[PDB]
């Protein structure tokens, strides 16, 4: 791998300012973040500023504590890219589903280290 689980969380699930959140956005972002070799079945990107995400995981102090699962208090603007039609290799076909909702993440050392991607499957 490369850096920490937090840095991977950001490259895999964070996109501050999307220039449109439609199906074209997914076709582009999935290719850009390297999620098309082979075609990934589903992938959600979180929007807005980073501090709001880091805040889901904050602790009173910094005394080492085990990792735990948390449901964020407030809602977030997210965009979920879902594979459509079963294309297994590029050109991967996707469809975007935009949303505003809470997210479930694993937290450690005050940073998000994993997104619960299964909750975005919906229908």
């Amino acid at each position: 791998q490369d850096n920490s689980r937090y840095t991977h969380f950001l490259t895999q699930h964070y996109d501050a300012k999307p220039q449109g959140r439609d199906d074209r956005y997914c076709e582009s972002i999935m290719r850009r973040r390297g999620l098309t070799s082979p075609c990934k079945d589903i992938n959600t990107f979180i929007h807005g500023n980073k501090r709001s995400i880091k805040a889901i995981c904050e602790n009173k102090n910094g005394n080492p504590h085990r990792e735990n699962l948390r449901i964020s208090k407030s809602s977030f603007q997210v965009t979920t890219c879902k594979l459509h039609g079963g294309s297994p290799w590029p050109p991967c076909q996707y469809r975007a589903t935009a949303g505003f909702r809470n997210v479930v993440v694993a937290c450690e050392n005050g940073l998000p280290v994993h997104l619960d991607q299964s909750i975005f499957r919906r229908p």
Partner: antibody
Amino acid sequence: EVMLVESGGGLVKPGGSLKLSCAASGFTFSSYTMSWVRQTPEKRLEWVATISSGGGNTYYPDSVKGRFTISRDIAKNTLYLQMSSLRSEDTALYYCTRLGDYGYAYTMDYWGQGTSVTVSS
Amino acid sequence: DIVLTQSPASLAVSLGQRATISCRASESVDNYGISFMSWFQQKPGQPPKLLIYAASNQGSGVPARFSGSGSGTDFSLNIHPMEEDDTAMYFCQQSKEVPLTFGAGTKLELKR
């Protein structure tokens, strides 16, 4: 349970054409990506073509691109391999296979018993 | 293409002992924490049968004596205890990218 019956193979003259078919049953055909894989006389396995569950994506190896065409008749639950400008190198046993999805790491979970093709004069 | 070098080409193992077959890829077959690698078993007079997918998961109805391991560019299939019914031709195969490619195969026979 699952079944894939191939047919249509035979002896064809070099330069000729041939169309293979695969009758699928026992599962929801249109809900799966499908492929053709051949086994040469020397016993090697060579991927020949794939078509997606939706039907919009087809893929081919450089060796047969421009000569082979895979397709599907939803109604008849049947996959096809249209072969043209056949060469002696195309002599082999052609298998019909079902591809698993992302969750199965795009593996081939079911193989039919195959139909043979012999390209010769 | 991702070239798969499978070895050895042939091997004979005694009952109860173990068979180890390896497959080395010229490039990684991994992504998203998954190894897009499969192992197939082909007995005489029959088409190939799925043995292992995602490098280490058992296909349906596949005995625990068959286990696959590895990641990146190096993979292995181990059979232990070897049984008389395991005589067959085995192949590895990658699905990370097209063209899909197979290893050249391993011929496994029972030693007696």
